[PDB]
Amino acid sequence: TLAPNRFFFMSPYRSFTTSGCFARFDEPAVNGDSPDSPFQQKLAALFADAKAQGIKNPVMVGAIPFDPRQPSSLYIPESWQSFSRQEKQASATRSQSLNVVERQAIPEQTTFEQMVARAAALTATPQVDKVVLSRLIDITTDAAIDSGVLLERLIAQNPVSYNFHVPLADGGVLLGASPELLLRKDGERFSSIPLAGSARRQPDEVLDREAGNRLLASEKDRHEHELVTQAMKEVLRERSSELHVPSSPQLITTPTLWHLATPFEGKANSQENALTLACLLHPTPALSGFPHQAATQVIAELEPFDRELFGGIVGWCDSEGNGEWVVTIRCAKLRENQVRLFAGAGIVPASSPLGEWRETGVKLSTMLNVFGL
Ligand SMILES: C=C(O[C@H]1C=CC=C(C(=O)O)[C@@H]1O)C(=O)O
Numbered sequence: 001t002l003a004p005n006r007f008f009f010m011s012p013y014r015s016f017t018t019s020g021c022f023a024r025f026d027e028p029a030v031n032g033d034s035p036d037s038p039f040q041q042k043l044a045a046l047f048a049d050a051k052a053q054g055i056k057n058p059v060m061v062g063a064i065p066f067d068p069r070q071p072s073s074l075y076i077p078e079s080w081q082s083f084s085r086q087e088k089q090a091s092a093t094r095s096q097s098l099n100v101v102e103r104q105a106i107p108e109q110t111t112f113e114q115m116v117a118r119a120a121a122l123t124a125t126p127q128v129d130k131v132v133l134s135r136l137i138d139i140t141t142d143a144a145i146d147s148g149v150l151l152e153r154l155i156a157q158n159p160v161s162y163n164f165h166v167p168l169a170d171g172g173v174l175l176g177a178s179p180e181l182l183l184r185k186d187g188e189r190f191s192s193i194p195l196a197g198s199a200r201r202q203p204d205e206v207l208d209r210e211a212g213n214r215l216l217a218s219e220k221d222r223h224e225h226e227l228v229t230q231a232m233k234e235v236l237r238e239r240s241s242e243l244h245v246p247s248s249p250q251l252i253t254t255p256t257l258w259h260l261a262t263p264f265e266g267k268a269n270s271q272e273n274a275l276t277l278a279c280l281l282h283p284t285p286a287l288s289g290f291p292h293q294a295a296t297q298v299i300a301e302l303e304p305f306d307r308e309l310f311g312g313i314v315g316w317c318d319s320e321g322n323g324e325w326v327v328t329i330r331c332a333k334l335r336e337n338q339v340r341l342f343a344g345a346g347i348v349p350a351s352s353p354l355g356e357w358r359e360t361g362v363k364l365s366t367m368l369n370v371f372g373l
């Protein structure tokens with residue numbers, strides 16, 4: 001299985017692992033949409049240094065937190081190794097039986113439901129339209145957790161998603177099956193596929209198609225979604241030479257959920273790379289809200305924890321400007337015998353406190369399934 005000190009990224013674009021560590025890069029990504037930012041300037045310096053020291057085709061990999069004024073968890077590895085996503089899907093079980101010493105919802109149901117009610121109340125006012133609220137599950141086991149076994153189970157349960165495994169500076173691992181592309185850049189073209197709006201999958205094909213059709217006709221979820229795509233369209237319109245965005249979202253699936261999705265396909269100029277555009281977008285109203293600053297204030301006032309890397313982005317950038325960044329969701333941080341799971345939900349005036357408790361619950365089940373819980 002995969003050692004915990006290696007980066008792993010599985011995607012229809014590039015799928016690869018890494019080995020070694022040439023240089024860690026913890027510069028905050030704030031203002032990274034600007035080529036003149038210290039983030040971009042130091043990124044460029046570090047790539048030039050890697051090549052000067054004989055690293056061919058250097059890549060920058062890792063995770064950027066929800067709040068990009070915080071330090072990043074990025075690094076250049078010594079080497080990288082492509083693999084076939086299709087072959088991995090075909091190949092991908094247990095090694096240990098784990099006991100649960102403690103399991104704690106943070107916050108608990110009544111508290112989260114009151115948070116949702118407060119956020120919904122705020123979204124009824126002119127000052128904010130949408131706020132994404134989140135919660136955690138902390139689990140302590142009695143034995144160190146085999147992150148490599150977990151990764152293989154994660155892939156087998158989520159063969160199609162953007163599956164990642166990120167070594168962290170504190171010895172932990174960030175692992176997840178993200179369904180949400182934030183920014184892919186491949187030559188001059190770029191894409192983004194925001195997700196917002198959720199309905200539970202059903203085991204029967206008839207009920208399942210009905211859930212999807214219900215989601216597409218749901219005013220609440222379509223509103224929750226259009227607040228994301230309108231904000232993104234406005235920003236991207238001024239930094240793209242062409243941009244195609246469909247008028248309506250389409251249905252996509254994970255193993256647990258239907259989501260509404262809108263693809264963005266654009267062309268960018270020579271000033272841009274995968275991280276300038278990813279930092280321009282991140283976080284969208286899928287993960288913070290709209291307007292962004294007002295939403296993050298409400299998040300800070302209501303969540304009894306710091307998100308850190310949760311709700312950030314994870315992926316990679318090379319020295320030519322190509323890269324891929326996905327939203328850090330359906331994910332967990334683990335270290336030794338401790339695990340933290342994360343899930344959020346976009347709150348609007350039509351949100352129900354119980355409904356959003358349940359929505360975040362279904363989201364948490366992706367990683368609960370990986371652990372066998
Ligand atoms: C913050 C999360 O979901 C975001 C992205 C997909 C669906 C969402 C929703 O439908 O509410 C959220 O905007 C999460 O999965 O933890």
Ligand SMILES: [Mg+2]
Binds near residue numbers: 198224359
């Ligand atoms: Mg939602």
